[PDB]
Subunit: 384 residues, 4 copies
């Protein structure tokens, strides 16, 4: 279960570089130079790395320092063959963003958020990124009177439209991917789920430039089914990128390594990504637990890729098994894929077998055989 470049495994600098500070605790690890992270990730088999502006160039850097940080990072990419498929802006750490970046009540802060984002889009394009993620972690509120949500959505649409106008004006090919999160750090965050983000994009001036970047743990923090949400994003043609990790139910964002947390949902997620032919990066946005030292960081990163590969094998074995294919037919998954009334409305209205002469009791008595199907899925996942 060894990673290959074709696996398109990527990691954020902030994942393996997380120093272990939490709401109740100081750092447990020293900061990592991005150069070292790129070298270690490449040795593990990763194919790419992603960054926030402030992960790559320390906030408040001079132009000379900025150029030096980029130069060293570019050298590490060149030394390893690593790609930079995606970048994003830090609009959450600095205290100025305490009430948001794009939807801050203070208009001067909203303007500043856009200028900081635009500067980094230019850098992202220079490093070859195809996707630019927006995670509005500070957009939201802890109390009802603090944020009029319709006004905040107007400000959020305004900002995304300006960014769309900027990329179009520069002839860039980069597309945006909005990453939903339901809460944390704000009490409630705006566009809290993949559904809210999909609905919002359809009101933007150039919707084609935007998609979603769903994260396993985020949808799970709302107790939602992550593979279902990904299916709806795929159905919309909007799965531009994805963040893989684990989460143990409704609680704070744990960012466990992928495979940890809800193992069965990880299995059905990989089954769906592979069956649907998702072709973007398989990006891990996780945090090696603060209990770990540097050796445990790299073990945790390797485990993300290993788990994806084991799950890929088992889901492929499941779908290819003739006994599973027979069970899928027994459960009528083939009939779910056939149109309900390709004959048309009038034909349906005149079809007595659809109503007047439909034997509801006979239909009701037919078992769905879903448990047998699911135990074949469990046996394949466990290699039983």
């Amino acid at each position: 279960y060894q990673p290959t470049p074709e696996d398109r495994f990527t990691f954020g600098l902030w994942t393996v570089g997380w120093q272990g500070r939490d709401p109740f605790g100081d750092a447990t690890r020293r900061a990592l130079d991005p150069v070292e992270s790129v070298q270690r990730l490449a040795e593990l088999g990763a194919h790419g790395v992603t960054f926030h502006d402030d992960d790559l160039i320390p906030f408040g850097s001079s132009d000379s320092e900025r150029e030096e940080h980029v130069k060293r990072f570019r050298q590490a990419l060149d030394d390893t063959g690593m790609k930079v498929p995606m970048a994003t802006t830090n609009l959450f750490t600095h205290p100025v963003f305490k009430d948001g970046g794009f939807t801050a009540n203070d208009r001067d802060v909203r303007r500043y958020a856009l200028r900081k984002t635009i500067r980094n889009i230019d850098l992202a394009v220079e490093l070859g990124a195809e996707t630019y993620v927006a995670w509005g972690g500070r957009e939201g509120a802890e109390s009802g009177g603090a944020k009029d949500v319709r006004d905040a959505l107007d400000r959020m649409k305004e900002a995304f439209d300006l960014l769309g106008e900027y990329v179009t004006s520069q002839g860039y090919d980069i597309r945006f991917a909005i990453e939903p999160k339901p809460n944390e750090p704000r009490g409630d965050i705006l566009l809290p789920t993949v559904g809210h983000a999909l609905a919002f994009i359809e009101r933007l001036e150039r919707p084609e430039l935007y998609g979603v970047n769903p994260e396993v743990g985020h949808e799970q923090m709302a107790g939602l089914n992550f593979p279902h949400g990904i299916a709806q994003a795929l159905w919309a043609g909007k799965l531009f990128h994805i963040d893989l990790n684990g989460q143990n139910g409704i609680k704070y964002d744990q960012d466990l390594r992928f495979g940890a947390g809800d193992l069965r949902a990880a299995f059905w997620l990989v089954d769906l990504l592979e069956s649907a032919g998702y072709s973007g990066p398989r990006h891990f946005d996780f945090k090696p637990p603060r209990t770990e030292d540097f050796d445990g960081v790299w073990a945790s990163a390797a485990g993300c890729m290993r788990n994806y590969l084991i799950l890929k094998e088992r889901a492929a074995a499941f779908r290819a098994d003739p006994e599973v294919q027979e069970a899928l037919r027994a459960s009528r998954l083939d009939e779910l894929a056939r149109p309900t009334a390709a004959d048309g409305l009038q034909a349906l209205l005149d079809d007595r077998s659809a109503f007047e002469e439909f034997d509801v009791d006979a239909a009701a008595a037919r078992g769905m055989a879903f448990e047998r199907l699911d135990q074949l899925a469990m046996d394949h996942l466990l290699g039983a």
Copy 2:
């Protein structure tokens, strides 16, 4: 705090008529004749009533029985002055819908679900309903292999498109409102939140014919903020109807009376509905607890309306209070409502005050004053 017709308070026959059966218990109340419910609700001050096909006409009724049930119900509406603003189809009780109505794996069941829905749309229009709700409570799954979600969304779009074609073909003015629910009775339900439902409608052939019918307790079962979701529905122009009740967090659907459950969210919800000028029915979809007898049913129904009216008074007093208006300005809610960059992209890019000369520390130091604002909101809610 006495209801008036202008309050547009409505109730489902199945709410006050709920007999108290739960997963672990038999009925605690006798069935109510819809005629009696219409009479009692009208005496409490309600203005309208809603129904599923099977609440008004027992499933499997002959045409003569159907006509008789409707005749008596029409007489009660006429005797009381009560309206029927909304109706819906029962696509969840009968065992034939065990795997769904519109998204059942069995194609014959999907066709039957549409024929049952169409028959009731005709009746709804005859009774004067303006909104027809779809609640796909059986659409979903308990296991991963049982339902391919992209195929189910294709079947769901197909069904909604056929229904849109049917209402258009009859020249009806009725519009549809899809009611999201994240789970229960299925392990996970398709279109689980207001966001997913809004995003789905934008892929339908005639999106203008569809909106949402969000329910307080449903969004709260995903731990989401209900007033935020309603704000996004309003922002989209899609709040066609609403279901009001209470819920105590993430657990089974409690359907408490409105005002119970999360009282502060009820306050901010009524504040938003009234400020936004929502003009549809204020419909209660709740269940008087099974501990209650018939007298407690009517007390619970009256309490729904009373609570809405007390909250309406307190939210109006809050928004009208000059001290609150000053606090809103102190927290910059006025600046949230002003465009970020009406000057345009190029002007923003050339504005040094937005970046090069923006004093982030001075901006960061400015408190938002949200706690003072929220304690004024608490004082108004409590009449302190």
Copy 3:
């Protein structure tokens, strides 16, 4: 992975016999005669069956009918070799228990609950049960003023003490096991978790006669860690029985088959039961989904046992693997098992290495190596 009698797999009559009625749906399966269930379960490899009074003898049965129902059930046990290790009372279905059995506000109902329980304890002992479960599903409230909790705990202690006095007076060897549940059907249920139940037992007159019957899905409905709760019950010497099933997080009680839901928690649970040498029944309290017909019921029941057996194999392989034993030492699990200060308080107070000369930085720098350990656990669970 075929069950043997030594596996002590048991099932409630109400599990495979569940007819599929839910809050929104009618039965999807015909009732099962307990005789048929005992025969089918025995054919699958189960070793025992459990019952509520009302599952075995229909509520309101005459003495002759009661004797006949018992006679046929005894014949089926004799025909199959099946055991009856545990029984319990239905104090939740009948409307008289709408506000509780032992803690009903109506005193006449509390007395009746005790008389109904006592009658069935006599029957349980006659059928050979060693454990009598109490699940106070109706003990609790939907509103604050409805139940004074200190008074309800007094009534609950009174009832358990009377039951303890009754078994002691008859010379029975049967012991009680209280099954916690946090909510559903009541908004909040009294003794909501294994901790609350353990604490309550320590205030009973004969605490030795009571233990707990924790259920996987119940603790998970509070988002608690089920193996941790079982560890605390074991630590207390109070794990008298256990209910095995699956649950997908915080939501209504799903009662999926064991292995479904949180698969990693099922793995750590079986690892703990086996390592601790738990010797009671491995009882499944689950509901085959209502999508299923009779064939799917038996497939679901078989899957419960299969999953327990696969997890038993993988956890045993994990603990026996020398590489895992080395990792456990690397993570200091051996040092967790050694007393902190067997040298005593004064020796600790005078030990400069414990404070004055303790190098906190050197200790802090040592990684815990938990991720490597956990990926060995994942590899064993998946057979990778």
Copy 4:
């Protein structure tokens, strides 16, 4: 609604002194000198303040610095009349406690945790504290193999027993109060709820020296009912202290000001504390949101006390209202408080009215009248 000394309102130095750092953000406020916090809290009407060792004396302080910090703090207490009723140890911030203090796998860390705790107990007693809180925020795990829970409970009992032996040996009158939390910062924390903590105390060598310090938001993070848990702690005689704040359901620990979050549960909590005659500190363990500046910190602290006082008034008005007293009788709360069978077991067994001649249907038909009672409670809370 102005605080008085008799209200016993207290606050932790770390509450109003919280600098606003979160998992995704830097500090938004400068550190406060404890002297200033004591002065400001006293001006607001608080009566006492509490501390962790490391809030009062910076970690790694020399003896001279330690004495100076204490001297200035003692001067501020003397200048204001403020009390120090409770203290606790910081066993979570420093990286050495990354795997716990008392239950760290590393034995040297467990010894160090006890020595750090003992040093601060001496200081707490010198400052007049009556209660010493233990919050084992780092005791727990993110993965199954990392912590054997029975061994960790042995180590936890060992540590508490040594602390009990230490206070007894010094003749101190101080008692301990264990504060449960279900998760955060560890994936799952040991003794996750008030029930688990109560059960654990009953296994300690001197149980009389230990009680609980429940926190509103903590029990709510498990979706549990906080007033119910407090009722069980009161029933056990173990409510030694309490932490008051708000929380909006199951998610990360928000620590909102008291009254925010679940307002109805705050009402029933204050009703219970006052009716039961709880006589310990009404301590606020909350964090003014990081959106706020210093003025908003003091507004938030004042709001905690104001809300407690408004709720105290409304709950007292509720219990004193003759119409509410009549409703309580109508709902049989008086019968809940009467023994079920003071006549004894044999009298119950021979009482035909308890079984043979009990009319279950007549009893079942009696409504509980809980909705009318609850709407009187809502009307009192809102002053309607």
